Amino acid sequence: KDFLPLYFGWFLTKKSSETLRKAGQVFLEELGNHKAFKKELRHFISGEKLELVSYFGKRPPGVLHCTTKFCDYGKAAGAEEYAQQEVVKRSYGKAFKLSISALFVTPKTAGAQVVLTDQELQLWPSDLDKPSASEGLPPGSRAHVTLGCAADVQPAQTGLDLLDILQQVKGGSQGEAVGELPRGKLYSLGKGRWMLSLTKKMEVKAIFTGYYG
Numbered sequence: 001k002d003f004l005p006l007y008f009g010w011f012l013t014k015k016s017s018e019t020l021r022k023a024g025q026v027f028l029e030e031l032g033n034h035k036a037f038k039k040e041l042r043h044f045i046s047g048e049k050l051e052l053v054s055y056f057g058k059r060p061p062g063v064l065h066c067t068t069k070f071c072d073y074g075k076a077a078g079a080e081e082y083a084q085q086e087v088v089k090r091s092y093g094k095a096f097k098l099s100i101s102a103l104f105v106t107p108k109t110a111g112a113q114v115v116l117t118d119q120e121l122q123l124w125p126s127d128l129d130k131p132s133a134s135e136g137l138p139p140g141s142r143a144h145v146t147l148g149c150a151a152d153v154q155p156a157q158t159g160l161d162l163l164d165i166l167q168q169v170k171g172g173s174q175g176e177a178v179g180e181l182p183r184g185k186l187y188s189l190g191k192g193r194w195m196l197s198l199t200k201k202m203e204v205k206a207i208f209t210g211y212y213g
């Protein structure tokens with residue numbers, strides 16, 4: 001039988017990767033410097049000034065991606081079923097534009113929120129065993145690009161952290177913006193969670209394909 005990928009997803013172009021990576025780093029430098037962030041450090045780490053670029057020391061080495069289905073070479077529940085879909089096979093190798101609406105930070109991860117189109121949502125997995133954090137929220141809400149994570153954090157965390165942030169915004173606990181950065185308004189959501197809502201959404205170009213590793 002055929003070996004499936006470790007995961008499927010949208011792999012950003014060199015140029016788009018660079019643009020997003022740089023905006024992520026700017027965001028981390030700006031946030032760590034902001035009075036509102038500094039004031040809440042006791043809620044971010046249990047340990048002065050914290051350099052977030054250093055804090056999120058495990059970062060993608062190269063091109064960035066937005067994962068659809070983690071398959072673990074076929075071992076993950078739902079993987080075979082996902083891989084066999086016509087839309088996945090038809091879409092393999094095709095170019096898409098992804099809309100980034102926000103950047104976020106938590107004690108565990110730094111990421112960018114992706115808002116998928118209906119066409120793109122046909123490639124979002126619809127599995128049997130789903131998480132309770134996805135509960136209530138529209139499919140594809142988890143979609144994101146991971147920009148870094150803290151030293152002992154495992155893969156899958158950024159998505160979890162996004163859903164949590166969205167479950168909060170859904171609750172109306174977003175609060176008034178506590179500052180304005182060049183790219184948009186900054187929100188403090190508590191328990192070390194921060195979100196920049198970009199005034200102007202970023203568009204990144206990407207290719208849908210499978211990563212083996």
Ligand SMILES: Nc1ncnc2c1ncn2[C@@H]1O[C@H](CO)[C@@H](O)[C@H]1OP(=O)(O)O
Pocket residue numbers: 007067069070145146154155156157158159160
């Ligand atoms: N259960 C899982 N185990 C490992 N990675 C997973 C995963 N579910 C989703 N992923 C995603 O698959 C990619 C490779 O691990 C990562 O983008 C990761 O999401 P993450 O960005 O939130 O870490």
